[PDB]
Amino acid sequence: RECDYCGTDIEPGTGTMFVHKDGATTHFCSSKCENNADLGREARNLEWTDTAR
Template sequence: MEERRCSFCNRIIEPGTGKLYARRDGTVFYFCSSKCENNVALGRVTRRVKWARKGA
């Protein structure tokens, strides 16, 4: 099974959970929670949010 990570906070997403979002241009985003999904929709940047993991 492929390991997927949240596109916003970089956490590992367990198989069968989370949400996949695909844009019209073919870009695919994976989200572990609605909290991460909403932060992307609001235009927030990961490096400015303290609870999001940086890098690893």
């Protein structure tokens, strides 16, 4: 699998599958990514993000 935030390959047997109010699914590889999105940031602007690399 691949992270729907950062884009880094997610390690099998690791992670959270967030489910939105509409129904959409978003897999995060870490708590860092979750809280970075809960702030209002987009993976594109964050430099350390592979999406941005």
